[PDB]
Amino acid sequence: RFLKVKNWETDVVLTDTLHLKSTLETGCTEHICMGSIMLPVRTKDQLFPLAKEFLDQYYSSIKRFGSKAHMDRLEEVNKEIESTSTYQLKDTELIYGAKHAWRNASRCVGRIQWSKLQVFDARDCTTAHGMFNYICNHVKYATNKGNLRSAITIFPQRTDGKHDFRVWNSQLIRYAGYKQPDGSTLGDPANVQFTEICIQQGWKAPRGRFDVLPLLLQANGNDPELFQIPPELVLEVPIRHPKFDWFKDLGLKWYGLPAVSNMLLEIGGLEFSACPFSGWYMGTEIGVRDYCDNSRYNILEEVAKKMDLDMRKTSSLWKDQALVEINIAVLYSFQSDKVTIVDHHSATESFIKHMENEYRCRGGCPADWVWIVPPMSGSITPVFHQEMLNYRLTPSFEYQPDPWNTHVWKG
């Protein structure tokens, strides 16, 4: 069965056959669409099919499907499974796996870049200190003095579920939040819970508005341990505006490296619970969401105050005016300091080209419209007008529960 998507701006119609390879469920039924819901110990049994499906896809990608090398690999994985109950990926299969998880990430607008990914194999890692060293190397390589390079570091896979490797941070680099006694928050409200854990684990918090968090790292199912990323490895950008000279006096800055570290990478039925990955920012992530969400830094009022906009009626669009100026500032600051960033016009246009190419070469491109359309100026970006099909392919990045909810403390 063939499925059509249409772009309502261009009338370009595309045909999807890739969705036929989809296994994992969506959350939707014939009676309910859950397309806007944020979040809608494996046995030998289920494992060999998952391995096989993956190795068939790998061997096809390399034009060796059905070859002796393909068949010997299936056989060797099969024996390894029923003997040791799991298996190990070859380096080439891991790299391919990690790239495809990104290729298949339906909420990622940056996927035109999917094949340029530096994969760091950290499967020989055994301790939290080993992890810290790996993560430092990743930050330094990815940062590259502002000329950002996509990378992923992959710690050992899950075994019995009791020896998991985890990065407790939700991103490698992120700012602390501190609920105050009067009920206000200092710093980033998204990171209050995790900040409170670090403090409990013995971090001495500077208690400012932009304190880079320490890494809280769990190796081999052991209690996690704290480490400070050397400050010389943490690239940051002071935020100023090309025209408004008071803008710098808001005291704003952000870090250049967006490094999601709390997701789970599934490849061939194997579960890599610590797999921090980074690219570079689209300006709206910081300018729209991190700065202007009500539950984040929430700077809209203070900015609009300085701009002396009419704030007594929403229909002045004072919020919308302030929002553009803030986003101009983020992009200007990053460009001026020569740190990679992409604007939402450039990034969405690239994605449409990516998506069309994928339909031609691959038979489809799973995409989550709710996430792909940028959080400001939605309909003046080409994605708003693009119909999309969302379905789940493996290899994949998946959510997992926060480790503090599940971890059995050793003491």
Ligand X SMILES: N=C(CO)NCCC[C@H](N)C(=O)O
Ligand Y SMILES: C[C@H](O)[C@H](O)[C@H]1CNc2nc(N)[nH]c(=O)c2N1
Active site residues: 108, 111, 280, 285
Binding of residue 37 to Zn ion (CB under 5 A): no
253's enclosing H/E stretch is strand 253-255
State the minimum distance, in angstroms, from the CB of residue 386 to a copy of itself.
8
Question: How far is residue 171's CA from residue 67's CA, in Å, rounded to a whole number?
Answer: 41
CA 51 to chain CA centroid, nearest Å:
25
3-state secondary structure labels for all residues of 197-211: HHHHHCCCCCCCCCC
Q: Report the residue number, 244 or 371, with the smaller CB distance to ligand Y.
A: 371
State the minimum distance, in angstroms, from the CB of residue 2 to Zn ion.
19
Residues 262-291 that bind a copy of itself (CB under 8 A): 283, 288-289
* Residue 36 annotated as part of some ligand binding site: yes
Binding of residue 403 to ligand X (CB under 6 A): no
State the minimum distance, in angstroms, from the CB of residue 170 to a copy of itself.
14
Identity of the amino acid at 281: Y
DSSP for residue 366:
-
- Residue 389 near which of Zn ion, a copy of itself, ligand X, none (CB within 5-8 Å, type-dependent): a copy of itself
- Beta strand pairing status for 151-154 and 277-278? antiparallel
Question: How far is residue 231's CA from residue 90's CA, in Å, rounded to a whole number?
Answer: 35
CA 370 to chain CA centroid, nearest Å:
16
* Residue 114 annotated as part of some ligand binding site: no
Binding of residue 189 to ligand X (CB under 6 A): no
Taking CB under 8 A as the criterion, the residue among 391, 394, 395, 396 binding a copy of itself is 391
* Residue 399 annotated as part of some ligand binding site: yes
- Collapsing DSSP states into helix, strand and coil, what is residue 222? coil
Taking CB under 6 A as the criterion, the residue among 52, 306, 362, 385 binding ligand Y is 385
| Total length of the chain | 411
Binding of residue 397 to ligand HEM (CB under 6 A): yes
Angle between helical axes of 91-103 and 44-61 (0-180°, round to 10): 90
Binding of residue 370 to ligand Y (CB under 6 A): yes
Taking CB under 8 A as the criterion, the residue among 62, 69, 71, 317 binding a copy of itself is 317
CB 163 within 8 A of CB 157: no
Sign of CA dihedral 110, 103, 38, 350: positive
Q: Report the residue number, 131 or 389, with the smaller CB distance to a copy of itself.
A: 389
Residues 257-316 that bind ligand Y (CB under 6 A): none
Binding of residue 263 to ligand X (CB under 6 A): no
Taking CB under 6 A as the criterion, the residue among 14, 55, 110, 390 binding ligand HEM is 110
- Residue 172 near which of ligand HEM, ligand Y, a copy of itself, none (CB within 5-8 Å, type-dependent): none
Taking CB under 6 A as the criterion, the residue among 55, 89, 94, 117 binding ligand HEM is 117
CB 174 within 8 A of CB 213: yes
CB 254 within 8 A of CB 237: yes
* Residue 171 annotated as part of some ligand binding site: yes
Binding of residue 343 to a copy of itself (CB under 8 A): yes
- Residue 28 near which of Zn ion, ligand HEM, ligand X, none (CB within 5-8 Å, type-dependent): Zn ion
* Residue 108 annotated as part of some ligand binding site: yes
260's enclosing H/E stretch is strand 259-260
- β-bridge mates for residue 120, sequence order: 153
Residues 6+ apart with CB under 8 A from 331: 283, 287, 341, 343
Binding of residue 371 to ligand Y (CB under 6 A): yes
DSSP for residue 227:
E
String of contacts with a copy of itself for each residue 172-211, x by CB under 8 A:
----------------------------------------
DSSP for residue 157:
P
State the minimum distance, in angstroms, from the CB of residue 24 to ligand HEM.
14
DSSP per-residue letters across 369-383 = HHHHS-SSSGGGSGG
* Residue 318 annotated as part of some ligand binding site: no
Question: How far is residue 259's CA from residue 170's CA, in Å, rounded to a whole number?
Answer: 8
Instruction: Give contact residues for ligand Y (rule: CB under 6 A).
Output: 8, 36, 38, 370-371, 384-387
Which residues contribute to the annotated binding site? 36, 108, 171, 280-281, 285, 370-371, 384, 399
Instruction: Give contact residues for ligand X (rule: CB under 6 A).
Output: 110, 171, 258, 260, 278-282, 285-286, 289-290
